[PDB]
Design an enzyme around this catalytic site. Structure first.
Site, mmCIF file in Angstrom:
data_model
loop_
_atom_site.group_PDB
_atom_site.id
_atom_site.type_symbol
_atom_site.label_atom_id
_atom_site.label_comp_id
_atom_site.label_asym_id
_atom_site.label_seq_id
_atom_site.Cartn_x
_atom_site.Cartn_y
_atom_site.Cartn_z
ATOM 1 N N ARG A 1 0.019 9.324 0.675
ATOM 2 C CA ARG A 1 -0.772 9.396 1.932
ATOM 3 C C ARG A 1 -0.190 8.454 3.002
ATOM 4 N NH1 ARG A 1 -3.802 6.384 -1.770
ATOM 5 N NH2 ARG A 1 -3.677 4.164 -1.229
ATOM 6 N N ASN A 2 0.673 7.476 2.617
ATOM 7 C CA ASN A 2 1.233 6.494 3.572
ATOM 8 C C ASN A 2 2.686 6.751 3.960
ATOM 9 O OD1 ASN A 2 -1.080 5.194 4.179
ATOM 10 N ND2 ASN A 2 -1.011 3.897 2.335
ATOM 11 N N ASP B 1 2.393 3.200 7.508
ATOM 12 C CA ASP B 1 1.240 2.343 7.260
ATOM 13 C C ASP B 1 1.607 0.892 6.915
ATOM 14 O OD1 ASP B 1 -1.950 3.125 6.912
ATOM 15 O OD2 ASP B 1 -1.398 1.372 5.696
ATOM 16 N N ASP C 1 0.822 -1.220 0.000
ATOM 17 C CA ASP C 1 0.000 0.000 0.000
ATOM 18 C C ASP C 1 0.869 1.291 0.000
ATOM 19 O OD1 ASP C 1 -2.314 1.690 0.091
ATOM 20 O OD2 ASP C 1 -2.512 1.447 2.286
#
Ligand code: SVH
Length: 259
Positions: free
Chosen positions: A123-124, A137, A119
């Site tokens: 955003r991570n 994350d 992932d």
């Protein structure tokens, strides 16, 4: 056991929410290591990384047994996507490539440890007080925060970030360091657009045929030609034909050094 934090050594500021995930909230916290440290505390209210140690990888401060709690370092500037999207921030193309290089180094470390992220997205990734990028994350800190970028598989329950996923991952739900290499290319495109959403005119169902047609994300206006060549290599239909993270670190650091 050597990861355990005594409840008296930690204060969770339950009124100070950092973020709301699917498995629980991340709160501001105070931890006594005998220095008093500001930290982030992940609650796992709905429901290995301890050995990982790299400046570009989010580390585990410990776990509080007591709802189980995951204690993590605090990231002053939050996630990388919101940092670059913030119109009051002034990153240069060099700052942005510098961020990409940092993510490549963290991913190079993880890939060597045979750890598949699954992932990777802007955003991570997080930014500390020194603007050091930490790939995050993953492991105990894994969760879904921005649910609009995910399809939940109705059979496996797997969260699928459809627009960051490799063509073979979309077909099989199998993830490798090479599918992580593909997501890295989308993450570089996020940096170069300062957090634009990828493929905005392509709906999640039409994405597979879009990628099968040899179609890819277009060159952002202020993206250097060699960096776009680096993105394009990440998105080759054959996983084996994609660069390793070690090759991405070498290529990107050479591009960064031209500035
Ligand atoms: O919106 C959000 N959801 C989660 C999150 C984090 C975060 C996650 C994390 F694993 C460690 C962290 N240390 N400092 C912040 C932080 C920052 N912002 C947001």
């Amino acid at each position: 056991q050597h990861v355990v934090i005594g409840p008296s050594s930690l204060i969770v500021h339950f009124n100070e929410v950092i973020g709301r995930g699917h498995f629980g909230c991340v709160y501001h916290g105070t931890l006594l290591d005998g220095k008093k440290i500001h930290c982030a505390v992940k609650s796992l209210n709905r429901i290995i990384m301890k050995d990982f140690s790299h400046p570009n990888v989010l580390s585990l401060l410990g776990i509080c047994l007591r709802s189980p709690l995951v204690v993590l370092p605090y990231m002053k500037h939050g996630d990388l996507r919101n940092f670059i999207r913030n119109e009051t921030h002034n990153p240069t193309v060099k700052d942005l490539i510098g961020f990409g290089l940092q993510v490549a180094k963290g991913m190079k470390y993880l890939a060597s440890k045979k750890f598949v992220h699954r992932d990777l997205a802007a955003r991570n990734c997080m930014l500390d007080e020194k603007f050091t990028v930490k790939v995050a994350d993953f492991g105990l800190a894994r969760d879904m925060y921005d649910k609009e970028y995910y399809s939940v598989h109705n059979k496996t329950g797997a969260k699928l970030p459809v627009k960051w996923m490799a063509l073979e991952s979309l077909q099989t739900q199998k993830f490798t360091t090479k599918s992580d290499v593909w997501s890295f290319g989308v993450l570089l495109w996020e940096l170069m657009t300062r957090g634009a959403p990828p493929y905005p005119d392509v709906n999640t169902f039409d994405i597979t045929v879009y990628l099968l047609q040899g179609r890819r994300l277009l060159q952002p206006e202020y993206c250097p030609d060699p960096l776009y060549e680096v993105m394009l290599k990440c998105w080759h239909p054959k996983a084996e034909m994609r660069p390793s993270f070690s090759e991405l670190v070498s290529r990107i650091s050479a591009i960064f050094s031209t500035f």
